Amino acid sequence: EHYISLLVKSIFIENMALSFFLGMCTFLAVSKKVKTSFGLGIAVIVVLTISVPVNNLVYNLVLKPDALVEGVDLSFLNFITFIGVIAALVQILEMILDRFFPPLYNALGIFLPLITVNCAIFGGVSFMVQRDYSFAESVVYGFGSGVGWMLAIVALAGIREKMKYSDVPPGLRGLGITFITAGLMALGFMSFSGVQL
Amino acid sequence: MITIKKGLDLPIAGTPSQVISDGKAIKKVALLGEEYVGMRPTMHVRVGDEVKKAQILFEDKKNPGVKFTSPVSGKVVEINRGAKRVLQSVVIEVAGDDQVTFDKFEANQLASLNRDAIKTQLVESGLWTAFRTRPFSKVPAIDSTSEAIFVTAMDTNPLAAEPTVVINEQSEAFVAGLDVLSALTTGKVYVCKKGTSLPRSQQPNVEEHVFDGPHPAGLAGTHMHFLYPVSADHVAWSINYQDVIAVGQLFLTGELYTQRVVSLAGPVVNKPRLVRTVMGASLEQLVDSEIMPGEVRIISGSVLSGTKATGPHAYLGRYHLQVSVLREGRDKELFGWAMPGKNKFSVTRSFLGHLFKGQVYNMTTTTNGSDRSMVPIGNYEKVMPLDMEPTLLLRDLCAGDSDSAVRLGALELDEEDLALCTFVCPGKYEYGQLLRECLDKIEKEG
Amino acid sequence: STIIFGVVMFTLIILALVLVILFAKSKLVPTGDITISINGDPEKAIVTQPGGKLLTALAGAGVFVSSACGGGGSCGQCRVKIKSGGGDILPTELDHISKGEAREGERLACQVAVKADMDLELPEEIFGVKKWECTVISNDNKATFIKELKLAIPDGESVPFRAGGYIQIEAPAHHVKYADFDVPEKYRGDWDKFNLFRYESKVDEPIIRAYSMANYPEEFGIIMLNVRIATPPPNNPNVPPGQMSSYIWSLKAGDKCTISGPFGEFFAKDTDAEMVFIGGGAGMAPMRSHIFDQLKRLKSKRKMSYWYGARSKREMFYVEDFDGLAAENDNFVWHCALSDPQPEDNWTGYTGFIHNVLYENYLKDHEAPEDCEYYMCGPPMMNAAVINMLKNLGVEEENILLDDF
Amino acid sequence: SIKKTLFVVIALSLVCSIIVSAAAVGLRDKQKENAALDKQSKILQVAGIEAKGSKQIVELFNKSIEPRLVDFNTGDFVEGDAANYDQRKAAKEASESIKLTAEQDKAKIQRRANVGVVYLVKDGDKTSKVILPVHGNGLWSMMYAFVAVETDGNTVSGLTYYEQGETPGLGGEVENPAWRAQWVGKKLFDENHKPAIKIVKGGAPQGSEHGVDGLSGATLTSNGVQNTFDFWLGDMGFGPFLTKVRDG
Amino acid sequence: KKSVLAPVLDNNPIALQVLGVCSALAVTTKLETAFVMTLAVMFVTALSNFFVSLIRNHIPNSVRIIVQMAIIASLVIVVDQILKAYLYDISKQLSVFVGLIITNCIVMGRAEAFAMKSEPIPSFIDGIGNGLGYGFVLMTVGFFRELLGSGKLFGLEVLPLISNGGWYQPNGLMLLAPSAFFLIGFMIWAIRTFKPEQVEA
Amino acid sequence: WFALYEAAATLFYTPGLVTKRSSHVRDSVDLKRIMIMVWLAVFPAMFWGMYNAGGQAIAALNHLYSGDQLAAIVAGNWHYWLTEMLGGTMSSDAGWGSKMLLGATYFLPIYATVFIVGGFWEVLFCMVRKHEVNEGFFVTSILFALIVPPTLPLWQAALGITFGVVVAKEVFGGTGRNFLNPALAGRAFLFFAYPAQISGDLVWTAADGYSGATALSQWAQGGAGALINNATGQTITWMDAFIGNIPGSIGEVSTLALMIGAAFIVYMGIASWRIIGGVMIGMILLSTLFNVIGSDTNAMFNMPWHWHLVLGGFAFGMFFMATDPVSASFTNSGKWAYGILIGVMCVLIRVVNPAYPEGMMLAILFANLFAPLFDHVVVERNIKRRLARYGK
Ligand SMILES: Cc1cc2nc3c(=O)[nH]c(=O)nc-3n(C[C@H](O)[C@H](O)[C@H](O)COP(=O)(O)OP(=O)(O)OC[C@H]3O[C@@H](n4cnc5c(N)ncnc54)[C@H](O)[C@@H]3O)c2cc1C
Ligand SMILES: CCCCCCCCCCCCO[C@@H]1O[C@H](CO)[C@@H](O[C@H]2O[C@H](CO)[C@@H](O)[C@H](O)[C@H]2O)[C@H](O)[C@H]1O
Ligand SMILES: Cc1cc2nc3c(=O)[nH]c(=O)nc-3n(C[C@H](O)[C@H](O)[C@H](O)CO)c2cc1C
Ligand code: FES
Ligand code: FES
Ligand SMILES: [K+]
Ligand code: NA
């Protein structure tokens, strides 16, 4: 249905990492091993899949113009609520994992401190506000965008591992070459540019 | 029983004759220090000393209790060292017949001998150096034990001797050696041979496995992967059939057996054949008046994985049962990389040579190119029958990634296992040394 | 109007977020004081609230872990055996811990963060520390930049230590001017060449450093030690002067300082192989104890060799002791090479750096340099030169022990 | 000390929120004026009235432009807050919008608002030309433009694309003044009162009544522009309204 | 001065550190947006550091992260109101990244690493320097992307375009995502070949 | 200047180097031969492409201009009257020789500038970094020069190759050390940097003032029935596209020439038949799927697999661009997945991406990013077997 189109839109057609430059710091930082990048990707999906729908409810119930009281709009308290809600949920998820899910805490709870108020989460939430997404639409977009982000970080991590045999000139070693690698990744991901799916 | 499909049987011209004949009289023998992995010699003799057939020549500091005995009785005429005072060789000039003796047992009682009695006798005589732990190709520690001893009764190396011919003359010794190995091993003994019949051991521990296919089928590393996979905590021992014969002779007569049969072969060998010689026999004297004129390279062991026989190293190796002599291909040709390869051999089908099936090539030592970055065109996957990803593993070795190389199976590999991967590399790498450097790093940090 | 609505919503939102966090903290973060078993002894067991680093928790109890870089995980002197707990080894720890050590359980106490119950197998030296406030007896200058410090035990008996050990001396914040230092007239002239007295040191905060002992175990009552003064590099004057070595130099007879027990992993091998000691600067301290240990404490008959790299005759000290030991016992022989003899020295022996003199005199014609224990000690420049020479001679790293200062 | 933690956050939240609320409520009118001015300038530009500076733009816009609300179904003026109407918001709500069928949705727009906004340009006390907001999907993103139609209801006085996401050089040429200046003089309809504007690929004939040169190497965007006009000039667009203009 | 200029070339937030790269790849298409973004980042980082340092001692560790987020978020909102009220067109060009300055890693990194354990005055100077260095990366990339991507600087035609009867054909890649990565990637190379101390082993 | 001189000396004469250790005998195959076999494998496509480009141009010129008008055009362009001075004729009666000659005047400058500019960056990096010049650039130059429109400006080619050689290859260490396809990286730079000169209807034929759509673009507009060549007004049949008598980039039009060239290297083992097999499976499966689903509005849905094969640069990309060993996956299982992704991605861009008429390049560039992952997935499965001792 329309949902499947949205999920593909959030992964391939609209990629948070490369097509919006969101979460690049954590995308160019833990992009050294596939496993650790895999761990961040799944953690970002969890945060996005729980941040976007929760933020959608609050916006449509509180911050939506002419929602609580006629003639008054609380849209100006948008960033505070989104950044505040995101930070609360990520911390809450981390603590419950460290208390009830030991193995998940090491697998996922380790990276949540990194995802705390991350550009990928806020951007995905903000773009939801810029559009008109229902609760069902918001959750799919949240899961979809996170999966699309996980796709870019894992793909970059795989390339960086393949680059173990490369001879990067000094100065380009480390960060410098990673930028060029990310740019080349963006060039390939532009294949889905003009697709209205 | 097990058939190997991937592999490269080098059709190098000048194969042996599979006939055992007396070699040139050898008046010089040596022990090669570099031949043993992780061996720091503690010299027990000095130049001018008089040794016997089994007197200790030096010990291993990093493997205490391992004694390297003199192959023959004579005078230590030189101790060749090199950069970092690395013990290149210890040369003995054969003069005399005095020899140490050890306990001797009837063939019937060999299987029932105590494990410790077997270990001490092997260590005392120096035959313990025949064994090699696969994970690192080091002589096993005295106190250590393994649940799988692999006896390599097949020789698929190019220009290699036929083990059946050699073993048939020493049938009793081989069976005796197997019985001793059966008692020594904690688990089973794998006799990896070909389809041809060989003497068999009645002990239930000894098992015969038949391997068929191109060259890689004949290596102990290949056998271990298919039969007893090795890892950090799964260690197996390797021993060639000739050494097993020596073990049987040692426990039958109580005297160290040093006679060996090696295939003196190669393009420049006038009459390639199997020749009876002694351990560490001076290849310079062995190939005397048996090579065509010109600049040639004498190699101990297969051309795929052998040692250059020049200067201090011009002596048969401990684990080498073959001598290959090759021409030196230093000539430069105009557009030699563009001509159609009527007389060129390659695993790929980009030369006319592969069209003429059954051809034999007068190979030389030329690299057939310069050193270049690895460009994987599928050559490696065509010569590695093990369940590994060779191209990715070779990239890890080139990059020096010890951690990843171990995960991909670098521990299960020996320098010889990568000889074909070195042979077919378009970039002209030497993966044997890269694997050795990687394995050393694992041991040191481990 | 809308201003009121925004303010109340803002306050409600922040309160909602913190309250769920605080409520989650109580019901998800068990504050049960983590109990760490030290050596398995119930009395040694320490109970501490969750948080902090294992180094702080251990220091609170009677167990003291030697630490130099502090809570950075940079030196590796605080290695501990964590039988259980603490999670996987951090990547930063592995830079100073080999994989084999990780398998055994070696971990840096400072680097590891305490978050759960753990089991520890700390050694005796960490388990128990002989913290004493010894009294300074003598502080005469042995050489141009070397001072011999004699310490009086405050509790009687003697410090339990092995040959080649060291003591972690602790000092508080203090200001010391180099003019306060007292030097002999012989070494005063060399100081007057540049007049190093102008330097002034101001230690703003307490510091902790290590100093190798110079007394053999059989010596009881006085703890001989050698201290090198820390000064700014000659090519880098813009550096504060020595902070700890300057402070110890300022002291004289009657002063007091803490030793915080002994420590060190420097020792010889209980074997029959030859020993070849080579020292430089402060390195003569551990060497002196080792020679004395092998002559009377053990009365070893193993061949002993000592080579000291010196710049001038004035630098040399303890020479009379070396001559007596060499004369009294032939198994031990000592030599010294001068990199730059003074015109009045009139040296007629070896001249130049030991890195080339030693090979050209002893190692070149020796039958087994590899089969001989080497105890190197001296400035880093000599260590790099000799190690290259020794490596070019074919000596394994396990066969050579180095104690840089 | 929970009491201290509650005090610091409460005091910090109040002062920060008070400043934020004052700025949000205080500056809200300014932001709306800034947003309004952006469209007001473009309407003036297509109308041909030269304005520079916010004071001049607002003054000229009030004196020369009379926004009105038009019902597409009947093409008749309706009473409302034309100056403060948001057509985009209406098209997203079913209350003031309809869902076009596949056959009718020639311009590829999902919804069409029931009532649209038009801007009459009065030189004196009488309208001289009318500006219609026409939008349609291009190759990359929706393209929005203002079309100036003379009192006759057939001639197009000018054109301007005030919002369009297209590749510069290929699809972004719609912003090019020469291509926009080419539309002047063209007749929207024919004698049959049917859409006649055609975007000729490769260049329309010189002097053509309804021929405008298409964007070079950008047929996809040129096709989108043609569809936008072919629809908004049809029955479901400004067709009925334009017919009323022809007779008054 | 040394502290102010330290994060320009010695400790750059984007060359050495990996903070603040989200905006560098987006708002660098034009110099007008990049320059305005630089001022917002400089103003927010400096103001956020000053307030966090002022209340650093009383900050609760339990809610220190939410406390710093609120002050940073509040400052961003006020700047957002200024951008919308004045420079509305620029606010449209910056789109959502104006609100993302809250998550911009420079603001949190300096508000935590330095502001929490420094006096208010030096923390304010540190914030300005960190933004100033982040601006150096922004403007250098923006200068190249706008000049070679459109033949304009700050909206002024520097290279005449063939579309406007000129001579220079704009490079369509400079306006796309990949161009920002390559320019920054080559920027680091240029920075680190003059300052090898930052080369990674 | 040692690096370049050594390459020239080693180029004329094989090195006299001998094995130093390990395998004392080495396989005859070397990188120098591998590149030359690939370089010679595209010769049939290059030679036909020159004939096709000139043949198409001549037909368009005659179809548009005649009499004194044609003569004025010929004298107005250096490509035309240069062909005349060398014995060619621009009239419709021109033989194969003149058609080939005209294409040569359009190809050789593109190949020459690409080689010179690309070579300078190769030698500059090797000289400065004290390496030995690699021969992998010989293949890179020709392939880039065969995936560009005949009318591409020379300066654009210099910029395209510079990006393809420097950013995509040299900064990664050089031949065998990068992950992306250098030639396609250069074309993708031209694709997005200067789309007007590498897209549309004014670039694929060398006839001045001629506007003619290609087979792929025409199919999207009106499906199979929309395939017509305006130069000769003759319907474009499958045989015409398969042979290569259609407008398009020089070297990609003829699928038959590429099949002959690709067959040789695939037989020699230089080019992986698994990648080629993977691409065909991906293209066939997805194209057949779109056929079944149908689309009353999108004509591309009904294009059969065999029409996808002979149209656009699918054949050239599948054979001489997707088989790049360095950028492809290094595992046999991964190569199948890598090839299938290329085939699927190329069909997706062709059908469901109106912006880009063809997507073989973007399909390969997209696949190059995920080639390591297909390796990582395969490797991890192998590692899992190893920890289980392969069930032994
Ligand atoms: C096991 C062990 C045993 C040791 N045994 C001895 C021993 O017997 N004798 C001995 O003298 N040392 C010994 N040391 C070294 C000891 O830790 C000190 O290096 C030494 O005592 C000088 O103390 P310091 O803190 O003043 O040196 P540092 O100040 O740490 O030395 C740094 C150098 O720069 C100068 N400097 C001073 N302050 C600063 C500053 N803030 N920044 C930069 N440079 C500065 C110093 O003058 C010196 O030249 C030993 C170390 C270890 C680990
Ligand atoms: C656009 C089409 C192409 C993109 C779609 C295909 C993507 C395929 C790659 C998926 C991501 C890689 O997925 C990879 O799966 C392997 C299994 O082989 C996991 O393998 C690993 O799993 C666990 C962790 O989860 C480890 O403890 C374990 O040692 C190892 O088996 C890797 O941790 C994961 O990184
Ligand atoms: C079968 C084969 C195909 C190749 N294809 C290409 C190609 O499409 N583009 C290119 O630049 N180099 C190509 N090369 C050369 C080289 O392998 C390539 O540039 C690598 O990416 C260099 O690391 C090819 C080489 C071979 C053997
Ligand atoms: S104190 Fe230095 S490593 Fe712990
Ligand atoms: S600024 Fe760092 S994640 Fe966006
Ligand atoms: K398409
Ligand atoms: Na074709």
Author numbering:
A (entry chain E): 2 to 198
B (entry chain A): 1 to 446
C (entry chain F): 2 to 406
D (entry chain C): 7 to 254
E (entry chain D): 8 to 208
F (entry chain B): 23 to 414
Provide the authors' original text about this structure:
In the human pathogen Vibrio cholerae, the sodium-pumping NADH:quinone oxidoreductase (Na+-NQR) generates a sodium gradient by a so far unknown mechanism. Na+-NQR is composed of three integral membrane subunits, NqrB, NqrD, and NqrE, and three hydrophilic subunits, NqrA, NqrC, and NqrF. The six subunits NqrA, B, C, D, E, and F of Na+-NQR harbor a unique set of cofactors that shuttle the electrons from NADH twice across the membrane to quinone. Here we show that ion pumping in Na+-NQR is driven by large conformational changes coupling electron transfer to ion translocation.
A total of six cryo-EM structures of Na+-NQR in the native state and in complex with ubiquinone-1 (UQ-1), ubiquinone-2 (UQ-2), NADH and ubiquinone-2, the inhibitor 2-decyl-4-quinazolinyl amine (DQA), or the inhibitor 2-heptyl-4-hydroxyquinoline n-oxide (HQNO) were determined at resolutions of 2.1 to 3.2 Å. The cryo-EM structures of Na+-NQR either isolated or bound to UQ-1 or UQ-2 represent the resting or oxidized state of the respiratory enzyme, in which NqrC resides at NqrB and NqrF flexibly adopts different conformations resulting in weak density for this subunit. The high-resolution cryo-EM structures reported here reveal the exact localization and nature of all cofactors, including a [2Fe-2S] cluster in subunits NqrD and NqrE. Moreover, two sodium ions were identified in NqrB. Two positions, Na-1 and Na-2, have been identified as ion-binding sites, with a coordination sphere of backbone carbonyls and water molecules that is typical of alkali metal ions. The map density, the average bond distances of 2.3–2.5 Å, and the coordination number of 4–5 are in excellent agreement with Na+. Both sites, Na-1 and Na-2, are located close to the periplasmic aspect. Na-1 is buried within NqrB, but Na-2 is at the surface of NqrB and located in close proximity to the region binding NqrC. Site Na-2, but not site Na-1, can accommodate the larger monovalent cations Rb+ and Cs+, indicating that Na-2 can bind K+ as well. Of note, the access to the periplasmic half-channel to the solvent is blocked in the cryo-EM structures by NqrC.
